[PDB]
Homo-oligomer: A and B are copies of this chain.
């Protein structure tokens, strides 16, 4: 049975079966090249601890590499997956890669999965659908696009990953935006989920047309009547509200809010997210699993001295600060505003007679960092005595999360 452990996992975990169907769609480079294979192994390990048979089967797609140290490679990669706390990818990346490399096969496979789940639920309860059933199907449909977690107020808060094309505010692409009410989920329950019910109706009508025993035909007719009665409830406001309220328990992800925007080396920009972990800095215009919510409206571009605006800004900086060493130190100090982590205990005091460009540069830095990362501070916060004992102080609260 050790050789059949993959099938043992298949019979017990529907998600493992769905992944196995999905993994066959990946092009050959994802098991031939070491980086892609390692990424797939890491994603499988992070998704579930018992998904090792799937990784072993996938690594056997190239037996020559598997025999030449692949087994030990798989073993130490599996160990590092528990060891490595930085390689945070899951089944979402695998699904995205499969969808990118084969849209039609991925679409038909996942639609077959949806239909199987809904058909099982319909048959089990004679077509009387309820909130939890549609909640389960909707979680199957979008388990990797919405995440809900309990905030500090004890209120469930919905988050959505923004993809290109969908309506959005400017600059919130490739990030987890916060939804007061899951609008897209409400639209999806009535628009897209209704077509699966059409497939169920087609299946029932096809079985009715099929010649069967009179008892079987009567049972199918009663099932069709019940399903038609229960079909229109997905357009009801109260029913959808109950469905989404029940779906909050399935979309729940523990410690999602705790890890949101905690990495100081990742900076959200207008055209994606900017990673300054290693030089040169890289812009992420593609799918990623970094939990980043806050952002600035500025679109990042590589530094170019020949840009007319760059020339104008450099000339202005030269005009404002004559001395070269002073100019370099000021630019170095202001550049640390990009990083949101612990840094040197320094403060800069700038004195001037007036009308000498002080507020221009200081405010330009805050304008380019945006409100989520930069803020003006009240002078009374620095030259006045502290409030007595305990009183609320929103001026001091502005200091949280800002660089």
Contacts and interface: CB of A to CB of B under 8 A. Distances in A.
A208 to B, nearest CB: 15
A209 interface: no
Given A254-B168, A255-B169, A246 B130 contact: no
A356 interface: no
Contact of A394 (B132, B156, B169, B388): B388
Interface string A227-241: 010011101111010
A250 B235 CA distance: 14
A231 to B, nearest CB: 7
Interface in A122-172: 125-126, 128, 130-133, 150, 154, 156, 167-170
Contact of A389 (B252, B255, B384): B384
A394 B386 CA distance: 10
B125 A231 contact: yes
B249 A187 contact: yes
A8 interface: no
A186 B156 CA distance: 15
A203 interface: no
Given A392-B388, A396-B389, A245 B254 contact: no
Interface string A72-106: 00000000000000000000000000000000000
A90 to B, nearest CB: 14
A250 B191 CA distance: 12
A263 to B, nearest CB: 16
B397 A235 contact: no
B248 A183 contact: yes
Contact of A380 (B186, B231, B381, B386): B386
Given A387-B390, A396-B389, A237 B231 contact: no
A258 interface: yes
A164 to B, nearest CB: 12
A328 interface: no
Interface string A26-49: 000000000000000000000000
